[model samples]
Target chain A: VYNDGYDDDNYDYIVKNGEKWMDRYEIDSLIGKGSFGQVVKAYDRVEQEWVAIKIIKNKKAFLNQAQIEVRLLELMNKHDTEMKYYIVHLKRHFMFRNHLCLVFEMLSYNLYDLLRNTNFRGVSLNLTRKFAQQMCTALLFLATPELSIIHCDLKPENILLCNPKRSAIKIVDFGSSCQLGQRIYQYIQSRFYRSPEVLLGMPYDLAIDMWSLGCILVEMHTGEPLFSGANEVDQMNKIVEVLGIPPAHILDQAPKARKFFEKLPDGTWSLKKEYKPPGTRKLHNILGVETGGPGGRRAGESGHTVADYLKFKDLILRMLDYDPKTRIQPYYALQHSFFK
Target chain B: YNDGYDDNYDYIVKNGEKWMDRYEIDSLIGKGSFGQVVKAYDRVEQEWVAIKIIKNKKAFLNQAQIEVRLLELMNKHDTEMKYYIVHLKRHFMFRNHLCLVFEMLSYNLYDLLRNTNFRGVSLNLTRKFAQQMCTALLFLATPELSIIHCDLKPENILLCNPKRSAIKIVDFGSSCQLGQYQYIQSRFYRSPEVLLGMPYDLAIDMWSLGCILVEMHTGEPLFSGANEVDQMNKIVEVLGIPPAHILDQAPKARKFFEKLPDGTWSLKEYKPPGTRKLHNILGVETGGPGGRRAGESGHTVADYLKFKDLILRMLDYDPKTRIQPYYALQHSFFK
Candidate 1:
């Protein structure tokens, strides 16, 4: 037996630089480690290329889950044979010392990293527009009749820039993704960008991804998550604070509605606690669209034009719609005046 | 009280014990790191099956799941079942152990070698196996199914019938899809590229196939290395010094050979064996063990030369230049 030298308690294969994998890929350094497993940057000797190998934990549940990721990636890769779609390309996969290793094309900094490069001040609307269009194209590809893939977890961290200087970006980490009508898990998507349908314990579809895109776009331009919730309840409350109450039909159908809402005297569902400011926070104010007004843009700091912010604000409102059924689809979102 | 498992996490089996009220345990077939294989009688189907029961440990169970996934994929794609790959019958869980059901086949090539009392088999029989193995390798290399049988020793190739030449590759527990497994393949059949820690692919399996073909005809392991050091030494004994380019690219080459002050590589503690040539090792045309006797069957000295040529290509130091299954099938040895 090959000595894996893994820590039994953690079941993570101990990674070392200059160590070879399958006698081919030369490990360079650690990239990141998460609950599922660790990803490392490696140089592919055979192809004379660089790659990122996602090393899953040597645990039963993780192994099973990673297989799903492999199947989904294989499906996505099959459809996007030309590699034009803005989804991360999976080069191949293999098992190393019981850990399922997924090799992917090496990509540059993630959007979150891009945000950090600007000291969290956010990128310009021009750059955001580029990212938004590519993201919409990627989402449209997933929503196509051939493949209705829902990226359950879409966030700044998951959207990576293909190259540092180029505006090219790719959606990655399909570990949480699923095809429509095959919804498997309820507790999915990140807390901040999670759609209201998922929060209310209702069935979701491709539109949930559009909801995440809305949250991601706002955060990309504003350098913060649109809804920063501490917990599920807090997340729903933050959504309510900005978007007002969810639609009556959605509230009536939500299995988990009681967790965040209570029936009012008039028999309509309302948030349990009153928001600090009586009315919902205006999207225009949050984006600082108006000058010399409360929560508006400050003097002498030219960002996106007022018209640009208005179009951007309109696109986000449709994305963050309380009702996923009525929420913006990728095709329409791309057709909106925002992209024009 | 211990959940039907012993201290080793292996399930304690009792003959005639019924599992899931469907299959009756017969006896143990073999045991390995994963756990054990047992001969089970399927009461419903009234046929024998090989049940690979995984160890009741978390790590073992996890590894077993991967094997299950690979088997299911292979079985699903092998629509006509013409591929020499083994068919997975079904899998189930019993007593916290993942049990994989496989069609019971005859003895493996290694067992056949032992049955021959270490004298090896006829070259004709070896050629029959060579054909099936090459076909299997070709099937595995199919773009849709790029499976690398990481461990391709004689023990994993099983004969379908006691008297038949047909065979199937089994024990995918160590298999992978053309990708890391720093240490794969059995040490004896381990490829030079793998031993030298160089980037490898399907060619590593060709290397193992070369070693197996020689072993099957000689009734002895061609390169039996007691350790990795001895392994490389054994290979060097027959194949001669490896190319400098291969040495230069290997991450573990330094472990086997040393760089001299004159910028030349030398095998560490190397003792040159007396005339361990490939033709002499096979005793080709010499009329002895592993050699052809006068008027022996239809194969001629010219055929032996072609076979030698194919093995030489299979054992190439550079995996990039090694004989692929497609080209190996086209070799004159098959003709």
Candidate 2:
């Protein structure tokens, strides 16, 4: 309603550190940038706390998506009265310079940053389990019959450590997320964590996030992405390299199945080009629990027994099931023997 | 003010309207992803100039800044403007858009082709353009510069005068200093090293130059591929399969070429024989419409063979072995 067009053209609002927004939030510094917009760390004058403001791009496409994030964040926050779920809280949102600004509770570095700090040797098994527990619980909370939300991009980069000194974490960046029935994009998850269904151009649901969670858990423990393909084609090859080709029935139903697979005269699906394995590539062997530590410590030396590793493997396999129908439900995934 | 885009983003540019109180807008030149280019008269300098007004959008603004940096550096090194590289006159911010003023130039090579009804130009005229381009490339390859014109196409090559064969390379937006990596290049002119995901160098520009030279006299893209894969197919059709040594270093070579049991790289699709004779292509272009007739001077088969040999050297799969501008200019074709 107020005339702000003079300075509200196309460029991103040049943020001046220590400058106030509506005399309420004092801009500090740019935290990150994405396709949609830039995120800045600012101090809330009225609330007396540090807040993260995602200043969206003025483009119509970005604005429309940013509003979806706002709606989902608000909906999630309204139902999260117990505040037990590991979802980042949205304090508020406003408009400035024709940009939609989303204010979120400031958190520490993301899990990827944490991995970098560890020199990419990865964190301890205990730490991985702690992160896994919180993540599973968060997924369970979102998968509730009433909410049924999907974290379209659930990578290490999107999961933040609530505090640098603590194990408690929060899942953030729901900008690409959508409600169960309101899927907006055919492509959703990052290439590395992309599921077989999504890769094959099949209709995806909450199970896709489970696939991402499984990939994320492995990366958190190993310090390297499990399926780090150079591109989409390479990504699928990487997946088949780890987990054998998807079943023929699954392949038959996919529109993009031929992109990665070929039919043999025997009526079975095979990878277009068989990928030479780098090592044994067995998840169990890669985990290094049986062979000692991922850093090559002796087995049973690091408080993570082979049994515990087996349980963890079982849960991850369930979560990573190729068929959405057979994939582990969030509620049951949290109740797995690995959690106990 | 409403005649064109207003102050909301693009500045309303009316013919005869003054900008920065110094340059008067003559007419709109063209609109690109970045923004608009306008022909304007510099009152202070008493000369016409082409002003590239970048879009106010953040992404375009940031990319334009890179272009400005590269252009400024190039202009500083080539003070005399004898290198055949475009000269940036000055730059200023007007209505929040980065406006880059350049020495006014005539039609691009593409426009020249269009004017000729795509029949192409004379071999002599193509030779004149090629020689100037060779010198410009030599300037970029100097140790002091080592700049890579990531995108080198007919559209980016502009003639200094409509009638004269003199030309200059413009649009350094996709260009970068040597020792950098990322992708940029027109599909038809893209080098094998770039297409196969190998670390490319200044030689990639030479590859593009080879493609450009072929297209110049032929009046059609020499190896126009519908996509990257088809592009490789088209290249293989003319050049035959790439060598094993060249494919060895390229990470993406596997996508287009497969290793046979005997330890040799071959294109995934079987190549039909008799498709690669460059002599046949030249024969058509030499005698066909838009080409010089068989009886014309310098239009003989021997002359066309010399041109093909130079192009083959320039389009070497290995950037390390690709013909340098200094060597290319001395080739028998140039003589």
Candidate 3:
């Protein structure tokens, strides 16, 4: 029996040593680290294929981490073949020296690093539309009843650019991934992209990923995290400053948020007062559009400032609606004119 | 093609004497507030299964008729093999002995968590289990056959295999079908509407799932307040206090809380005299883990800083705002 508390000692036992892989295909260096583990480029000896090995560091300190990883891989593996554009392949899981090594199909780079490398110079509208469309398709695949998978952390980090020639996008990182009924014990996901319901400690669902998608899309155009506040309150303030303070009716709908506002010991202006809803102005400012800087909306071949990009930004805001219930879904967003 | 009931109801009697006679009782599988479960072998099929025999006569009788009716509707509406824990057969409702035979293997989640010591379930496996449970719950959430599994707990959930699993949602004796207008579920798993005794819908299951998920991850019940007041306090600690509108709607609920002098009720207050003073617990934050500390000018940890956003949606107190199982199915957590 293993200790299930978040203790460091237990993690050591879970990541037992001597779990070796017989098919060791050496390839490239490290790429990225997700919430649960690290991803490295490797060669599959059997298939003679280049693969990405997602080596998960099981939290022996946290009980059930191994089981969570295994279960996630099992679902992904089951749906991998059917979902071509949206899914990543889970080649296998190997236990070497106590570490659980999850083998995956290798991709060149994620949209985040790729965008970062470009210094927010921003992708072409067509290219952005192409990526958005692909994401929508992937979301539809994930939303399928058979899989019903929610990529809880849908930030640029989890989305890989895949092979350059194909210009395809692959969704990766199942660490924070949870099925509909599955509830994470603690909080997950980076702060900037988190939804308001999440900030209120309400149990969230797939809409959170939609919020992440919204943040990622804006970041893609603006080259900055959408709500890069120092903390959760500031984050809420950031959201309020842009999108007017949430409506009284909407606030009434969210009991958790309402409670936080009413019982707050020190009367802070953050939650109590009515603020602005997140919309175009914040979007423009974040994207450096109003300021008209280097990375701001650029003149296209037709001499039009990339205000065309704002259409996608609007679509993204709809997806990032403060209210999770009202947030535009990937399936619906896929049909937006921006994608067309 | 049928009224959903078959004449073969007495098939178990003709095949075997005692319910356990037909099936070889394997081992003690699990125990619940009302019944005890034993892993058994079906002599006819040679398969592993769980047998839940209601122990409390009054509770079972109070819930049996409804259970049989709902199960009939469920079996008829959703025929998929994995949609439910296969009800191999049932024992006589008479003799104060009602037995529900179920397909079983491995262990109940509670036992599994105990075996692992409540740290957390694997994220992937938890999602997989959650997805399966969602499918089953979604089947029940339909307007034609609305059934709320009022008591959704770890003990009620069973593993189908080492990796994959299913939500059996046993102990349906407490379950109630939502007719033209009806709402039912347990208090701990109940939504605020249910807590306030207001009219509710299928959204109650969403609340239960929130508690269940948190338990699965933390290996402890999210809210274990002995009474409603204490429960509300626990909820407030994690989710904060109820707003005036919701509170005004149910004066009784507010009056119950008014008895608590400090406007808070939790296990933390019940600590023995010599125990360490409880300051800030991790799960009790207002805006979640990394929110601004009440007095500090500097920004605190943002809610998204420590955890993913989906979790917060599941814990939504208002039933209307709560994430439905359908939308939740598509969350990034499952990705």
Candidate 4:
């Protein structure tokens, strides 16, 4: 028997006839689990290659997942180089019993495992620049002003590293991806990398992806997640710590920003007061802005203070602006001096 | 503690055979797409007020609900704009109909423009109107509660008093939740993206304002295209063809106008030479009905030319490049 609704128990196993896998490819262990189902590594019988098959827990029940997977695959098919170099694609969707399978070219390891092993040893500046460029390129291609496609859930775990020599990054998990033309019922995306606009309950656009990129860039460099706050309020504080709380003039212009500030409950570092934390001010210090004391000079001989890093930090902070309209666009940000 | 008015003493009730009620019907002022505007004397308050009686039951219900929700949100989000525009006084949804009671206004911009023969609307008037409109739009465009006045035409603009020369933007039937969805507006003043069936942003209202400004100056529509295709052609004629990237995104729009033969229309297959050239065309006769003739009088043309630079910025073909409301408000033209 098949249950269509979100049933966590019965969804674990249900095999339908047409959806049967011949085992021509040997099934390996489960790699990940999501709201829909699990992704497994398997050997392709016909192609004689390793592949990751995302098996739908219950195809009839999770139609939206199936539909999204198919659409994403179709979009991926158009860019072959993207698939070969950045993405891993084996074939179109394959049905096995009550399950639908999305086949992908297998990678040596995911970003999660790599980050875990590296203990957050940030990637080299050159590698960081390259990955940032590639990630932005993919985003630029996907974010058509007419037909906006936002990767709602952008986190290190969702990004898979293709190979060590190439250092190519592939963005997977379109389950949270959505087209921007119409209204959507669900609030997608992970918490840590979510843009301020999203956290403030404002409708988001391509800029949300930029927020994720900022998080990924910092994480790839430090080998640890940036601003891993416990809740929405803490997340905002982490954001404010990086990008100083928006001034009243900017907040006045963006009512949504004010709304978020007003709605936030009373706390030590809440919007009610200017309670700047010692660690929060240390952000400028970390970026090599000031020294140990209040308003200290640049830390290094290069004369790079936290203020000097404004150009680089501005690129990310702009992405996290409470208002989506004012955020720095991906294509526009590409022309920034940092990228140059 | 607040002594605004008394409801019982000054008010009188009159009933008629039509409804077996003693409610007095007053003078008819104007009529709109959905309702009738009338001046009624409130016996209880001993004051004259404007009341809009919506005829259609479904229309009333839809608008009432939308207005209630919009007002609630607006009250929470916008306080400054409430002072400028006529905030909803009171609304009641009766059997199959709705009545909206509002403060009385002397006249609207439509009447003023008509009386002025749509020409020589003093710079002060334009500045005052622009300032009021900007304040209202700025308040409305707030990201927390973005309110899109989907319908922004001269007719919807009401004048509070002739002495103060104040302008109040009214009518929000077509308004909706901005950034969430797109809604259609009057064709003649519609933006290219809307006509092309492409997704639009808040800049669309600015486009409408551009048309309104030009109409205020010339007493004629900038683009009076009969249909959507003709509208694009007219737009291209006036603004020149959009860039390839813009056209590429809207392939359907490109295809629609691609069939027009060159030289048949000014904007068809046209490209902007530069901002300087655009300024020159605004001053001199380039083409079209309103263009300045070679040997004709260039009297007020200089005034138009003076503001030509700012106008070009406002009437930009690309929505992204169009002067934002915040920036537009700061332009010398408004000052």
Candidate 5:
């Protein structure tokens, strides 16, 4: 706000226009500024390329988070390119002005921003399949035992458009991410896309991110959040309404599950619902499959058939599984008939 | 014009004009160099529709026939799968003008862009729109005798309702088989080879698409120019001067970018070259004029670089090297 995107201060605060970094990166504009740090769009003088420089704020906790993120990025980057990985690669990192500056290949806008750009009109089935497939591929890579990185904050905001046409995407924001067995964040995920396991105060894992993917894919088509909860209780209630109480067994594993659910007469559980709920919007209804399969077809009509829509629906259901243990892993998901 | 028409059919159409007393003309919804589209009420179907009446029926009858046939072909059960193309309801000869009736629709992309002040849209909406467009263009590019949408500008892409994301390609008046209409297509979107009198095809549409996408990402046209010269200069400015052989693709090389005395191929009768690397103008590293504006922080230096690659592929000088519809959809840029 002070200058072209630089704020004047001591060390003088603010990255100025043409301000040099690493004797290569020239600050041009602020890509983004959050409570913890700012990502600047800068030109790499030596490489003659554009790169994102994530400069952590002077806060110590933020610096620690940056250190972990850059390390994870490096480990992920070291993975085989054969994984067909879609995660943004880390170019480099540094300690500048007592702040950890992580450099990365710049990408376009995020899916969250993209969705809003559509004015919430949502995406078509074709793109939905492709986007979900790419997400699965990336998750599959992370699921590898040697590199099971759980993206704690997996949401549209963290999924960025990578290529210019903005057709392709790359996952970002490892601030809340961690290695599988070394999970650290107690509470995580964006509100609407939060997995049920997390909401029930249950220990979460990589599959939790898949659940978020399910919500995101659904939102990408429906133009609205699949499960919109006002608060934690409401979110839990929202999850309950859709998946029907997450199976008593899964609920039993959840420590504070009863905060929102009640044992029902039929041995199933219910929301007990709402943080005020908007009835249960079954996946079928939300997907606009009232007449039949998700995508409509007059019998004998070809192209992406009702069969394909059903396959797509089946995948979503699997991804949205209430029991994290039973949820489809990315490797198996990649083989889903829906993609074929 | 051929065995398809009634040479002596009536062509007198005007306000309050009734077509066989089954349709009533309300008002002209649109007009172009060759025809006028009027909003009409179909009494028989009791539905609202649009009637497009051509100015020179004889010169346009076959052209309209091409448009009609393409729609009819597209409407075939197998080809009916696409969602991004306008459907022709039916057609008839009114007085001397050939009238093509299409389903009534609302605003086009141009109107939407104006409504939003052309700051451009989210990559989400842009990608959504772009995907369907690819589907539509792919439909036109294939084994079905292949037609190229000679004009693929904003005005030609219409939406069913401004509030919805569905869009369809309209105004097939400028469409023709690849290589058939070399001299057509708007100048601003003209491919580089087009300036050199080179034969062009559907790839020209790809070039237009490249430009449209930039406009969709940024508010203004990527290469807005006052004339052909300015447009060519604009393209070279961003894409950099086309290679010498690239200039040689056309029979007349010097017409646009003749060899400069400096040995570097520059614009013929040179104006200042669009010297800033397109990445700078687009602020791929920074939010340039066409860079991220209202959106939240996804704009990174790499995104701009990848974007430039996609744009380069679309705007390539050699039609042979230019990415086609199918390959373009497969391009990492759209993946």
Candidate 6:
């Protein structure tokens, strides 16, 4: 009887750095470790450029998650020549040790991490405007009817820096992403950026991500979470405190709305403490306009003029409107005065 | 999606069934950023243990192996009493999956801190865990196995049980030989030396410890900057300013810092003020009107002062001048 790959204490099985794979793709070092799998920096022998290899575990559940990510990325890669929005191109996939391996275009710092690498301070509005533009372009592509991809997990961490510097960014981490109008997972989007509809337990569409974009822009200016919350209850309360209660009608439509709110006699709703209500939230001051122009790369360099703040406030109001149905979509946002 | 594997494979064993016809498959302990950590009953050893079953990604498996090997060496070292490091009992394959067997621990310090409403821990309790950390780090820096725990944060420090303060450091994927530094550690606890990409050693871990120490006391990070630039700037805002000699050593220094004609360096956006902000760390400084003061720990000013001094030694601006772990343990703060 032979134990082909099994031995109680076989030390030979330990994978090592500087190990070669698939007759190519030399393992350089670990790039990162995340909730799902790991990304490794590799010297791709065939293409000869430093590439990133995502090593996903060989479990049925995770493999299924990866397929969606790979499929969405592949579809996006085909139309990227127009350069409306950018995503890391998937190089290929292979299996080793019964795990699925995906090769992708190498990327540098993620926007969230880069902001940390540089400091949590937001980039200049000129730069912010540019990055914002690129994101919208990406969103526009995904929002299309045929390719209507709902990037359910949109946040600063998912947007990565593509080049040597911070001028360009590519949206990534589609593990939690899905096509438009699909509900693969009920708990979607990061807590802070989660849209009202998703939180209200109402059926949602592409507009959910637009709310996330508005939140990202606010975070880009202020080096803090726009709606910092401890839990789902706290998250919604922050959203309500900013946008002011998701219109009573919308909440009236959802099955799970009351789980978070207590409509007061004067027509305003209060949050349940058990849902982790972060007692109070002050938005305008917290996300106050920083008048960040092209020169204000470092935070607090020059406080953004109130006019600049008004423009941003106006844009955010439309995007984060309580009703996702009426919330400004990307096509409309691209034309906002904030961009101009 | 032909993911290069036989899609038909069970990949998982039925619960209570012998996995390799010996170890009984059981519940999943946890899932890390990269893979699943399941618990299993070892029939041979007649014990319950945690199994870190890494998916078949060869590179990831290789990375996991490095962690396991590092743990094995540390576990074998000074064998008389295993210095509070997680024990990797065995490694093997179940089907094509690369598996590691570890003696299970209940949870980590971060979870414990969260359960306390993140109100910060007692200075008395902080001393016990910090000492264990000192010995753990001192052992890693030893010549026999100089493993630089590049990512030593609260989440990585697992508590053996809720009863005692004994903690074990896990996740050596980011650990490396001293001086072979790369981008390591999380943003909150990243060091100034690490930020400048200046040559580093176990001192980088010391820097991480300094960050964690303040966090344990204050319930928040001292330099919780939003980005790399902000982090260093936060340090300068509180630690005075980085001197010219130190700036001269860092190649990326100018990118993040601005040098004046007087050779005094400051963050590009703001000038360094005269006062240090360690008071912000302990919440000892008085708040502005209506702003609350740091939590009232019963410890006197002298206690706070000792903690500050130890933090300063660990977070020395120059890595070369930073206090070594062995000597750091001897500081009066621990006493």
- Give the number of the best model, judged by lDDT: 1
Worst 10 residues of 5 chain B by lDDT: B2-11
* Model 4: per-residue Cα lDDT over B1-335, one tens digit each: 00221121111212221111422456667655455666766666556677676644232344445665676677665366665566666676433246677777777777777887745354335556766776777777878768778788888888787767777777776676764422166767788777655778777878888777656555556677665666666676666667656665663554454534432322323334232244443333342123533344433454445456566776777888988778877876654
The candidates, ranked best first by TM-score, are 1, 2, 6, 5, 3, 4
Q: Give the whole-model CA lDDT for all candidates, comma-separated.
A: 0.80, 0.79, 0.59, 0.61, 0.71, 0.71
Docking class of 5: incorrect
- The global Cα lDDT (0 to 1) of model 5 is 0.71
Model 1 complex DockQ against the native: 0.04
lDDT per residue for candidate 3 within A1-340, as digits (tens), equals 2123211332332322223256466646666653345667666667878777665544321113434555766775665555554677676776543356667777777787777777856665566667777887877777767666666667887788777656688887665566787663324566787778777776677778777777777667656676776555667777776775666555655645753354345543235543354343466555543444225455433322456545765797798676788888777787787755
| lDDT measured at residue B38 in model 1 versus the true structure, 0 to 100 | 98
Ranking by lDDT: 1, 2, 5, 6, 4, 3
User: Which of candidates 1 and 5 reaches a greater DockQ?
Assistant: 1
TM-score of every model versus the real structure: 0.53, 0.52, 0.45, 0.44, 0.47, 0.48
True contacts kept of 6: 0.00
User: Which regions of candidate 5 fall more than 4 Å away from where they truly are?
Assistant: A1-12, A264-268, A273-280, A290-305, B1-335
lDDT tens digits by residue: candidate 4, A121-212: 55444466677777877777677554467777788777777775677888776765677774352234576888776766556677788878
- Across residues B111-211, which tens digit of lDDT does each residue of candidate 5 receive? 87887697777655776677677777788876675777777898889889878999888877666665432234676677776666677767778888888
Interface RMSD of structure candidate 5 (Å): 30.2
Worst 10 residues of 6 chain A by lDDT: A1-10
At residue B204, give the lDDT of candidate 4. 80
User: Could you tell me how far off, in angstroms, the CA of residue A267 lies in candidate 2 after the best superposition?
Assistant: 90
User: A1-340, model 1: which lDDT tens digit per residue?
Assistant: 2232453456677887899877789999998997577989999999999999998875445665677789888877767344336888899997565457899999998999998987877777778889998898888788776678887889898988887889999988886667887775666778898888889889878888888888988888778777888667878888877778878888888899998899988998787764444236777787776652123433345546677778888988988877777888878888999887
For model 4 chain B, where is the 10-residue window of minimal lDDT? B1-10
Taking all chains together, the TM-score of candidate 1 against the true structure is: 0.53
List native contact recovery per candidate, as a fraction of 1: 0.06, 0.00, 0.00, 0.00, 0.00, 0.00
What is the TM-score of candidate 6?
Answer: 0.48
Lowest-sum lDDT 10-residue window in model 6 chain B: B1-10
